[PDB]
């Protein structure tokens, strides 16, 4: 993650006896301004780092990560500066949930930057309450019963995301088969609208699998774009205006390489 106000992240292999090896991007010597590389690690004096829901995020919206505490009975965090200043422990009258299943953990639709958690799916809508890392009570609502129900976790050759193929910035619900794709209009508090399909994609469905699939916007609009892997290629489908998808681009893998279930794709601004 980026902690050091970096705008781009340090690598940091880090565990329970964790190394804190903050291997981070430094300018390459010579060459243009754009030249960069990852230098030495730096381990640091740091938190209990274990059995805590211990995790990366700034949750309060502080511009500072808020390394999470949620263990058995114990709840709070520690805040970390760009200076590496791990603040003293933070009990705050936090009101974290049961996390009953971490499945379907909501985040975005509460509001940009103040993300909050709601386990949810068909016929019902649990409610957020996060303000700046504090909470009111949560609630129950539902969107109207005619609206189609987005639903989570069924691995039957398909994918789900909270993701804004529409590039509004609202990471709309989408459901993605090998044949059909569907996105719910953001209705924020307690609701979505009836979903719209998008068009411009298919795969040989008997040959398909969930994943082998990647989701970053690449056209820079905000309309999340799509990649599939292939025995020697990637297929890249680009979102027509937030509505449909262009003919997929065929990218040969590096020579002799083929991608497979060991292999991990990613996108980051090198």
């Amino acid at each position: 993650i980026d902690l050091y106000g970096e705008g781009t992240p340090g690598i940091l292999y880090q565990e329970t006896p964790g190394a804190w090896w903050y291997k981070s991007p430094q300018r390459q010597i010579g060459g243009d301004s754009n030249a960069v590389t990852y230098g030495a690690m730096k381990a640091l004096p740091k938190i209990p780092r274990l059995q805590e829901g211990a995790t990366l995020m700034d949750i309060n919206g502080d511009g500072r990560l808020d390394w999470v505490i949620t263990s058995a009975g114990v709840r709070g965090f520690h805040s970390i500066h760009s200076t590496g200043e791990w603040t003293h422990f933070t009990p705050l009258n936090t009101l974290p949930t049961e996390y009953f299943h971490p499945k379907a953990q909501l985040a975005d639709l509460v509001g940009a930057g103040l993300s909050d958690l709601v386990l949810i799916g068909p016929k019902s809508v649990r409610l957020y309450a996060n303000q700046q890392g504090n909470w009111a009570p949560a609630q129950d609502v539902t969107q109207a019963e005619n609206v189609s129900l987005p639903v989570i976790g069924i691995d039957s050759r398909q994918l789900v995301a909270f993701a804004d193929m529409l590039g509004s910035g609202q990471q709309h619900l989408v459901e993605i088969t090998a044949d059909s794709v569907k996105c719910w209009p953001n209705m924020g508090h307690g609701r979505f609208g009836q979903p719209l399909t998008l068009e411009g994609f298919s795969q040989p469905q008997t040959s398909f699998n969930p994943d082998r699939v990647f989701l970053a916007d690449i056209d820079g609009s905000g309309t999340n774009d799509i990649i599939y892997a292939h025995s020697e290629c990637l297929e890249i489908y680009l979102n027509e205006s937030g509505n449909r998808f262009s003919k997929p681009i065929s990218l040969l893998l590096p020579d002799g390489v083929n991608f497979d279930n060991t292999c991990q794709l990613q996108a980051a601004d090198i």
Binding site: S207, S231, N258, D260
Partner: peptide
């Protein structure tokens, strides 16, 4: 060794090298 896979018309054309995980013991 002798090694095999059964043809069940699967995506065999996709494959690539295997990995072994071998375990053994020894007297000092």
């Amino acid at each position: 060794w002798r090694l095999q896979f059964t043809n069940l018309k699967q995506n065999l054309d996709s494959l690539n090298d295997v990995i072994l995980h071998v375990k053994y013991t020894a007297a000092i």
